[PDB]
Design a protein around this ligand. Sequence first.
Ligand code: NI
Ligand code: NI
Ligand code: NI
Ligand code: NI
Ligand code: NI
Ligand code: NI
Lengths: 173, 173, 173, 173, 173, 173
Amino acid sequence: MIEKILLVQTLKRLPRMGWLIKGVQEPESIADHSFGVAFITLVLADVLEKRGKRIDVEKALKMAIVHDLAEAIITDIPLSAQEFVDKDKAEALVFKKVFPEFYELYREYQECSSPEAQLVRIADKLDMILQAYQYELSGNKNLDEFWEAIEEIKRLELSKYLEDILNSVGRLK
Amino acid sequence: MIEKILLVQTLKRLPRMGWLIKGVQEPESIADHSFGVAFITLVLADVLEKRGKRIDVEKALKMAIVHDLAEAIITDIPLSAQEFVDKDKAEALVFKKVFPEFYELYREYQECSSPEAQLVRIADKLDMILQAYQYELSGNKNLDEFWEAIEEIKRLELSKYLEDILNSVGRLK
Amino acid sequence: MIEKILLVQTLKRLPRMGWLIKGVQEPESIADHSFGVAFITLVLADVLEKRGKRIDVEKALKMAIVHDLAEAIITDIPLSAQEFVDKDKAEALVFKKVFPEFYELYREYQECSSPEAQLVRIADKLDMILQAYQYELSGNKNLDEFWEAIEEIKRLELSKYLEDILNSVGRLK
Amino acid sequence: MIEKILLVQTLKRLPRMGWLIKGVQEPESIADHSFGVAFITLVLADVLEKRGKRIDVEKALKMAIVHDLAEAIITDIPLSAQEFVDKDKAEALVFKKVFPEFYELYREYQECSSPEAQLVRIADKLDMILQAYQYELSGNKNLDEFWEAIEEIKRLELSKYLEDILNSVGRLK
Amino acid sequence: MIEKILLVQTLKRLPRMGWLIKGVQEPESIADHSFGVAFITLVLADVLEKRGKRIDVEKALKMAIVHDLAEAIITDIPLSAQEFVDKDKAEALVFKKVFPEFYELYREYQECSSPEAQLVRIADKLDMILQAYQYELSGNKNLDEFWEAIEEIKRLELSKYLEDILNSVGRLK
Amino acid sequence: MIEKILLVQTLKRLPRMGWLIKGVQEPESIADHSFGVAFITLVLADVLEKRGKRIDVEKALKMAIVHDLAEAIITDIPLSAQEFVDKDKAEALVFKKVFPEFYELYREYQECSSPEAQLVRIADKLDMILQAYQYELSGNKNLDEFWEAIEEIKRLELSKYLEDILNSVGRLK
Ligand code: NI
Ligand code: NI
Ligand code: NI
Ligand code: NI
Ligand code: NI
Ligand code: NI
């Protein structure tokens, strides 16, 4: 339906708030980010494929495309604000009322248990670490917490199959 | 303290979300909006003064300067998102923890009972309405809803002393 | 590999040129556009699914994700410029030199024969038509031509299953 | 009156020209700046309050709100340009013709003699210094001059009560 | 000298203020404008050549390039502000102290007597009118006044040779 | 003709793509760049004049104004993309079909043989180098390659007369 699409297209206009709070001049939109997660999810899926780890690619890509979809209505409430706002409670609600067809993908994603759910989570973090890397090259000097994003990925089983990649990333540091 | 000032200066960086969601190019920041509320509050207290309506101007101006201060942390969570997000609960928390010295000003502003409180509330809406007016001249054609804030103002006792001004405003549409 | 991902991420920075030439302020990025294509592809896929038309969703989503990938190097050369530049020849080249793993998806996409290929093409054109619609609500009045993409969609067999939707779209103008 | 307010709101749209000349991407508007001045003035007034220095806060806040009001018409003519244009003479004129009701506040502010006038001047400069600080964190490296405004503040009697604070500020450099 | 060139390049960063005041969000820079004046000057000069009117093209092109050069220091102070600021006085000063080598071109330009001086003045106005045209297509609806510059052009002798063109321009409204 | 002028005015809207790819936030337009080339060409012409090297200044200035004119149609296709696109072939075509009157100024410029051709080429690069310099002051740290344009300049005979200037430029790095 046209009304749903027009709604999700608001993501092209919504900024990724963390960057603004860090003084990043023209930050990427939530949609730019979502594209990045989707692409990294695709690329990583192939790597996992040829390393013996089988992944339900379809589910993965759908999960990457829809993972931040609730923000089309509640916006990318930054982590710094989440000490005062329950963004999680809000997301579930929106998915249950506005995006019921995607609530299963959302629910599984939050659980971060399945191979697909962990992949998207890793793609989410990599797009960010690497986006931070870019903004650093642009001159921003307060993109400080990366050893804890890298470390957050390391805490996921699925990372075991990607250690060499995550090593190249931390090497950009 | 410098830390606090640096924190509130974030307002210059955070956009007024309602405009973004409506597709407005280069929307004003929260600080831009706050200045306007501060000015209109000044001007309107002036008018109330010479019409026999007693106003604690000092408290009013303070209230106007601090009214959206919590957003320095939680951002300008749009109305469209407040169906899933309790923004007011979040604001009270930030004020209680991060701006305890302004909690009472905030608390009185939320109650919208006292003359000062309703004045700032009226200034807040007028800035917005007049801002929607300006963006329409820029070419945006979906800010229509914003003009029903005139009716919200009319439901406040204090507006009884400003009727004339509210109608000039409505005539701008 | 990190080098590939960083490259594709350039898409978040490159603008969709047609909008600039038409004078739109702050035009979407190629990545914004791609995300949209990917979402519409998802949504339409499931519409086709429960209408008897079988779609290899995995291939479709992958196809939508990488359809404009060559632009990460070529940039979104506008249609007005393609009378002097062979964007098609340049794309193919990028894809078999830089993106050989995606050359098949690209090649099938260009042929616009398979159900998936036509679906992505339709997603591509709808995102744009709907994007033009949004910019018009912003005030831009010379995006008229963009609406004749509805006819371009009608010329594809797969649209046969979407007539009701296409009607709602054209109804927006 | 609506016309006046609409005029003052022009400040949301005008840049603070010093940043532009120095190459800063998206510089704050004059209204962004004013709000900061108003806030710092509020904060500093409380500090002065509990340190034995009585301040007429109401006048101080009005003064901060109105201090750059003439730029709504003349724009924030940069210091580098003032060697060829008498901004001061321009400001007074705009204030007597267009803002006669704020001329006294402006006149006192320019004299920088009274406690309130020096407070607002101190707020004006702290906002700027802190703003320069923020832009340096974004990568701009030619804002060094802006830091010698600490010395300009030291030359004001009122600073005597704020030694500790301006120490912390110069410490940020 | 490098210092001079770096100074004039500031024109790439400074906005043409009239547009900002009128609410046009991403206004051209003074350098954008100057390039247009230079191009129109070139184009018209050729038309004038084929029409019997001989022009000192070299002088005209230099005059077009240098005409707003003083703004590199004084900024494009808007017409609405020139009721309170003598922009002309300031311009001559800059040219005398900073651009002595270009003072003659400036002086002759302001006199608007010679064929070259009038040509640049016409070019200056045409770029502006055509620029207002483009911003109206973008949705701005308060640039009406800018069209009365066609009349200002008619008052110049040289226009006599360009009637047909001025008609095509006025026809765009 | 009004159609031609409007076309070339597109240059004000089109970004210089190299900067974008490098992460520069607000890049200069092609028009901004052309103005700078036009100014530097003027300034250097005078220098050459008083050093015994005679230059057809009229041709030089015309050549600097239209040197990147084809980009009004094909855009500023970056150097990084030219391994896949033949920008040169594309430019010549546009000039032959759309700018026939400026074709020989274009062809001479490309040959980089005549004093005027080499002067514009040197202005072209100097503007870029100095533009790179400015962006580095803004915080961008990956513009290093752009400084090897000094060596490209040295390869042109005409530079023999400018050694001292080139030394001041390289001195800025
Ligand atoms: Ni995400
Ligand atoms: Ni508010
Ligand atoms: Ni596409
Ligand atoms: Ni100020
Ligand atoms: Ni001009
Ligand atoms: Ni060039």
